[PDB]
Amino acid sequence: MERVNVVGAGLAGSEAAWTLLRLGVPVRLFEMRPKRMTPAHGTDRFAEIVCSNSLGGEGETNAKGLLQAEMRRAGSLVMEAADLARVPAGGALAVDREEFSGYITERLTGHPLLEVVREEVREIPPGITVLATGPLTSEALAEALKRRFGDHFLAYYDAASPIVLYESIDLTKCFRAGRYGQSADYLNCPMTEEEYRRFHQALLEAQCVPVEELARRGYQTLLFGPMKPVGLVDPRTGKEPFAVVQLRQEDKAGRMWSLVGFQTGLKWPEQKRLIQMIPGLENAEIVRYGVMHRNTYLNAPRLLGETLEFREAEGLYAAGVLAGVEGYLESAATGFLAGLNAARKALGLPPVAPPEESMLGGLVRYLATANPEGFQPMYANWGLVPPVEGRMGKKEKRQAMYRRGLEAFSAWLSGLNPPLPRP
Numbered sequence: 001m002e003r004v005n006v007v008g009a010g011l012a013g014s015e016a017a018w019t020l021l022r023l024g025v026p027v028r029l030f031e032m033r034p035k036r037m038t039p040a041h042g043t044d045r046f047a048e049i050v051c052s053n054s055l056g057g058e059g060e061t062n063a064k065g066l067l068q069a070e071m072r073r074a075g076s077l078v079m080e081a082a083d084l085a086r087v088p089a090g091g092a093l094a095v096d097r098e099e100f101s102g103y104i105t106e107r108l109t110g111h112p113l114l115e116v117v118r119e120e121v122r123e124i125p126p127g128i129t130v131l132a133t134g135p136l137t138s139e140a141l142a143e144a145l146k147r148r149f150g151d152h153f154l155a156y157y158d159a160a161s162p163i164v165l166y167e168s169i170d171l172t173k174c175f176r177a178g179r180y181g182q183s184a185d186y187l188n189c190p191m192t193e194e195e196y197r198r199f200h201q202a203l204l205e206a207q208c209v210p211v212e213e214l215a216r217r218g219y220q221t222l223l224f225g226p227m228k229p230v231g232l233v234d235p236r237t238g239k240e241p242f243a244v245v246q247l248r249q250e251d252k253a254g255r256m257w258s259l260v261g262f263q264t265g266l267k268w269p270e271q272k273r274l275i276q277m278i279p280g281l282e283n284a285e286i287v288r289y290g291v292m293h294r295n296t297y298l299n300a301p302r303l304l305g306e307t308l309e310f311r312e313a314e315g316l317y318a319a320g321v322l323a324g325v326e327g328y329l330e331s332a333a334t335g336f337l338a339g340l341n342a343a344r345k346a347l348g349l350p351p352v353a354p355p356e357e358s359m360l361g362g363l364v365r366y367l368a369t370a371n372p373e374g375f376q377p378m379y380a381n382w383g384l385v386p387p388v389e390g391r392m393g394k395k396e397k398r399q400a401m402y403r404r405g406l407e408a409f410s411a412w413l414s415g416l417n418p419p420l421p422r423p
């Protein structure tokens, strides 16, 4: 019909291309490597794994585990490669990285419907196009995306604060409120002077400014910063608290709230330790840890639909880190969806999206509808899907969520018209 462009042959680009091919749609796959390398890549292989060889935990209480199962059910090339290249790593799905990318490279390159172009794409290609250029998207394409969609809707670094599950918050210790300049819908966690003092020092021991760097500059620094109580009034004392930690709603459904101004580079167990010191958050469940690093991505809530098609550019898609996710598997899975919808478009069919119970479904809903102001990248986590009701233990609830999501995803796949062929 029409040959579809896929820009970038990483995790997301490789899966997109494959999905197009599986549906008999011809692909033009651009990859600048090796003509131009990124600071993190060392080969010219498709889907090169640049760091850890882990695709995440595979257990039935792990959100990444559910996403693995969905992609396996979908006949994903990345999962096929991963299962073949698997090496023992207790708990996690880990791979021999060269075998993995070699297998993926061979399968794609040897497909007759696939044409590979070894060039840096400097402008958005016309026609039906999937952009999947990753955290180290070439500067020229990044600037082309800004020119086309707006210079505040692409970032070159993230600065993400920890996000906690709302249902894990002890709300008796908080209050909704804003100060002048703020929306009245922040959650506030008040601290006494002694509570702040101990918090500040634990932060020293834990080691757009990273929050720990502010502590390091002194006791007063945080208080002048993101923990300033000015303009707030505790309705439990009728007074302005000594200090506060504010939380803001991140997802449309309200299951996920971030700590305001808590961008951080602390190790994950240190973040957990620190957050559980905050009144209201003592047994809060962190579902997305804070990070700050070089990372090119689009503001998905301002730009994309749940289908991963650009809302204001028909037949254009983003996948992977560029689309606002984080993680090898998350990149591949959004690659799959974007490739599926791009293929459908080429075939004159309307777009689809997985259900909200599935991890991929929960993930793309979040990309499309999360809080757009200061949007940060998201990885798979249980905050993304509806909870299971009950008084049974956490592990049992999560197992149920896993089973319900994989079942919803499988039914969705089965309903596909046209269907994806068996692997």
Ligand SMILES: Cc1cc2nc3c(=O)[nH]c(=O)nc-3n(C[C@H](O)[C@H](O)[C@H](O)COP(=O)(O)OP(=O)(O)OC[C@H]3O[C@@H](n4cnc5c(N)ncnc54)[C@H](O)[C@@H]3O)c2cc1C
Residues within 6 Å of the ligand: 007, 008, 009, 010, 011, 012, 013, 030, 031, 032, 033, 037, 038, 040, 041, 047, 048, 049, 050, 051, 052, 053, 054, 119, 120, 121, 122, 132, 133, 134, 135, 136, 137, 138, 141, 319, 320, 321, 322, 326, 327, 328, 329, 331, 332
């Ligand atoms: C240093 C580092 C460490 C990471 N560690 C982990 C980790 O431990 N675990 C984890 O889950 N994830 C990790 N990631 C995060 C992320 O999940 C991976 O980067 C993942 O590969 C993202 O998939 P992707 O397809 O979106 O991007 P990529 O896999 O990077 O694919 C993008 C491709 O597009 C190409 N490209 C870029 N610009 C152009 C252009 N203009 N024209 C043509 N081609 C272009 C690139 O050469 C690249 O091949 C890490 C990332 C980095 C940078």
